[PDB]
């Protein structure tokens, strides 16, 4: 990326390209730098000035950025339409055959189910209204439904249907048969750097999409990333997602993945998602999270402590990227600077990353889960199968009237 090479802004003046070219070429001119790599950097700087100073060459190099901007502007128009008029009551419980449980939580459970007409398989998230009111998660579960129905991105699980009855709220999502990234990661031990990087790039792209909508995800962790049949991530579990234009304050999420400013009483923004990306890349490459302890407050002390220990098998580029994502100071954290996500996409650790190809899913997955049909749930763990009770009376009607 030529602007990064020259230390420049896309909207740079012709003059500012000329001086940045003189400024950067000096720091690598053989007369002043015979260190390893000085000569290739000197070539790259000359290349950058040549593209950026020629108006025709610059106009078409600028198309990469302009296509991203156009893609995001359209994604926003589409999102805002569904955001303003959300889908409600687009199916009914009796339309589905409940198979088995695929996962659980404080709120309820996700069940493998099959549509009785079309035979299609889905994952139905069941939430008990009373429990949700009890755990004061009303707005959170309204955020989740309204956000998941309105977004559309290759690495976000699709909400297919939603509805409620007297007792429960229901979210019927696309079924992802490959299982959680958590199981595979714990089983394999750790991913190799190019393996972690393949997943990380998909997350970077998804956060770029989500933050352009002013959405904060707030629960990045391997438990929440599903592997599809071509080995690509599907993000599920939007129970802490929120639309936030300015700042927000809630202490929620998973202790291991919380940014300092979530734990601290001050408010925070979308930058907490980039901190959690740092935690995720660390856990993926190391096999364990960088802040674990028995008590949450012990985890909180390590998080705000500003100190991180890296395994020996961590490359220099990985540690340098992780130092910038796991940056306690908000004004220094990657993702949160003037250049935003581009600082992350232009980082050396990602140098081999073909972003367009990732987005198109043209890249070969380094892991494809062992499949045996559209219902071989062996990539998921087994859970106790409780039965689904629907009361004769509507519980919490008012609290959930917009669901």
């Amino acid at each position: 990326d030529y602007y990064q090479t020259l230390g420049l802004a896309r909207g740079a003046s012709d003059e500012e390209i000329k001086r940045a070219y003189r400024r950067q070429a000096l720091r690598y001119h053989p007369d002043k730098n015979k260190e390893p790599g000085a000569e290739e950097k000197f070539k790259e700087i000359a290349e950058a000035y040549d593209v950026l100073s020629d108006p025709r060459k610059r106009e078409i190099f600028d198309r990469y950025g302009e296509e991203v901007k156009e893609f995001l502007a359209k994604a926003k128009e589409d999102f805002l339409k569904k955001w303003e008029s959300p889908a409600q009551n687009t199916a009914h419980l009796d339309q589905f055959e409940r198979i088995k449980t695929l996962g659980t939580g404080s709120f309820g459970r996700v069940m493998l189910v099959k549509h009785k007409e079309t035979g299609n398989h889905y994952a139905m998230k069941i939430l008990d209204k009373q429990k949700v009111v009890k755990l004061k998660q009303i707005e959170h579960t309204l955020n989740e439904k309204r956000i998941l129905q309105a977004v559309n991105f290759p690495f976000l699980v699709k909400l297919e249907f939603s509805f409620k009855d007297n007792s429960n709220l229901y979210m019927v999502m696309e079924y992802v048969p490959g299982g959680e990234m958590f199981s595979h990661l714990r089983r394999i031990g750790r991913f190799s750097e190019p393996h972690a990087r393949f997943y990380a790039a998909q997350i970077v792209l998804t956060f770029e999409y989500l933050h352009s909508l002013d959405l904060i995800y707030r629960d990045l962790k391997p438990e929440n990333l599903l592997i599809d049949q071509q080995g690509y991530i599907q993000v599920t579990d939007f129970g802490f997602a929120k639309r936030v234009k300015g700042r927000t304050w809630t202490l929620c999420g998973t202790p291991e993945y919380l940014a300092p400013e979530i734990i601290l009483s001050k408010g925070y923004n979308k930058a907490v998602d980039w901190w959690a990306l740092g935690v995720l890349i660390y856990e993926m490459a190391a096999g364990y999270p960088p802040f674990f302890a028995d008590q949450p407050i012990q985890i909180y002390e390590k998080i705000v402590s500003g100190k991180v220990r890296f395994p020996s098998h961590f490359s220099s580029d990985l540690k340098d990227l992780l130092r910038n994502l796991l940056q306690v100071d908000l004004t220094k954290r990657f993702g949160n600077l003037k250049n935003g996500v581009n600082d992350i996409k232009n980082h050396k650790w990602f140098a081999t990353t073909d972003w367009i190809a990732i987005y198109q899913r043209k890249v070969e997955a380094p892991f494809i889960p062992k499949f045996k049909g559209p219902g071989d749930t062996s990539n998921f763990d087994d859970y106790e199968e409780e039965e689904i009770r629907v009361s004769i009376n509507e519980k919490c009607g008012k609290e959930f009237s917009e669901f």
Partner: peptide
């Protein structure tokens, strides 16, 4: 190693969320 401390800790399981 820290990875050894990780599995020597029983807490290699699914992490609970918090919502204060």
């Amino acid at each position: 190693t820290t990875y050894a401390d990780f599995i020597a800790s029983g807490r290699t399981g699914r992490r609970n969320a918090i919502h204060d």
